[PDB]
């Protein structure tokens, strides 16, 4: 069950842009609604809620999915925040988005769900597909000849591909080698607050 309503409204309500191309956000940075200008009492609960809402609604992940992501990260021997952010980035939708083959998380998720890609020579169609270290992702010809995919691959001038991701050729092959580090991910927001709240 995906989200159908507006993507700009969440950015307006939570006070920080998400897509980055949102003109309405900068047009009216104040909260939407009839009384967005009214002052709101500051509270740790409010802060934690805003951070977790930002993360979950920016990545489009579902709530139970995020919850067992967090539990797996906590059980992981490494630090909970790092494990959570790495497993969250491991999602194939975000992988392709940061590889630059996709312009938006929603369209990337739909493409993965319909399964225009090939995983190790076998077609897999799961938006929340787990991608591990040292994997291979291929592209089908029905996707290569697809118009929007051509537009993306010939207009991929978005933010630079991260270290763990890299494209090899026109086939748009994505590879992962090592375990991302929080610092070199440099993701917005912070994870210490979210882990604290989920510990609460």
């Amino acid at each position: 069950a995906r989200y159908t309503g507006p993507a700009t409204r969440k950015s307006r309500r939570l006070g920080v842009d998400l897509v980055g191309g949102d003109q309405s956000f900068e047009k009216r940075p104040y909260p939407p609604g009839q009384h967005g200008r009214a002052r709101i009492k500051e509270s740790e609960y409010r802060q934690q809620l805003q951070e977790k809402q930002k993360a979950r609604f920016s990545y489009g992940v579902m709530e139970k999915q995020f919850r067992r992501y967090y539990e797996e990260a906590n059980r992981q021997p490494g630090k909970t925040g790092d494990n959570l952010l790495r497993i969250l980035e491991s999602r194939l939708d975000n992988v392709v988005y940061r590889a630059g083959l996709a312009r938006t998380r929603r369209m990337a998720r739909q493409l993965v769900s319909h399964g225009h890609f090939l995983v190790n020579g076998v077609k897999v169609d799961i938006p929340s597909y787990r991608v591990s270290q040292y994997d291979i992702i291929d592209v089908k010809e029905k996707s290569l000849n697809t118009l929007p995919f051509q537009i993306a691959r010939e207009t991929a001038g978005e933010r630079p591909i991260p270290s763990w991701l890299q494209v090899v050729g026109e086939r748009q092959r994505i590879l992962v080698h090592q375990l991302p580090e929080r610092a070199q991910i440099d993701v917005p927001l912070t994870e210490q607050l979210i882990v604290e709240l989920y510990s609460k």
Binding site: Y134, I136, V168, G169, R171, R173
Partner: protein
């Protein structure tokens, strides 16, 4: 009256079978004395694994394996080894080794570059 039995474990769509030596009056999934082998029907290799020494010891002390267990004994080589008529021959076929992910990656990188 000890006989070797197959215990139904695993999953409905691909059953998994152990090879067990137990009394004839015990359960299909209950009391067991030892675990000695297994059977995998789903894999078309049809992986077979058995403890030759334990099987030989049980056959010597006087087990009465059923028809399927005896067939598996022929397939592995234990029954004909005990009987001594043809000798010891291995008809089992090993699963095809999976090509290494490292060499697959190397070939893919070479093709790309």
């Amino acid at each position: 009256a000890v006989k070797i039995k197959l215990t139904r474990l695993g999953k409905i769509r691909n059953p998994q079978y152990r090879i067990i030596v137990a009394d004839a009056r015990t359960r299909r999934d209950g009391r067991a004395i030892e675990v000695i082998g297994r059977y995998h029907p789903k894999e078309e290799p049809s992986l077979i694994q058995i403890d030759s020494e334990r099987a030989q010891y049980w056959l010597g002390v006087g087990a009465q394996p059923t028809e399927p267990v005896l067939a598996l004994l022929k397939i592995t080589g234990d029954w004909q080894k005990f009987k001594g008529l043809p000798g010891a021959e291995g008809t089992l076929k090993v699963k095809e080794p999976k090509p290494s992910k490292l060499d697959l990656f190397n070939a893919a990188l070479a093709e790309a570059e």
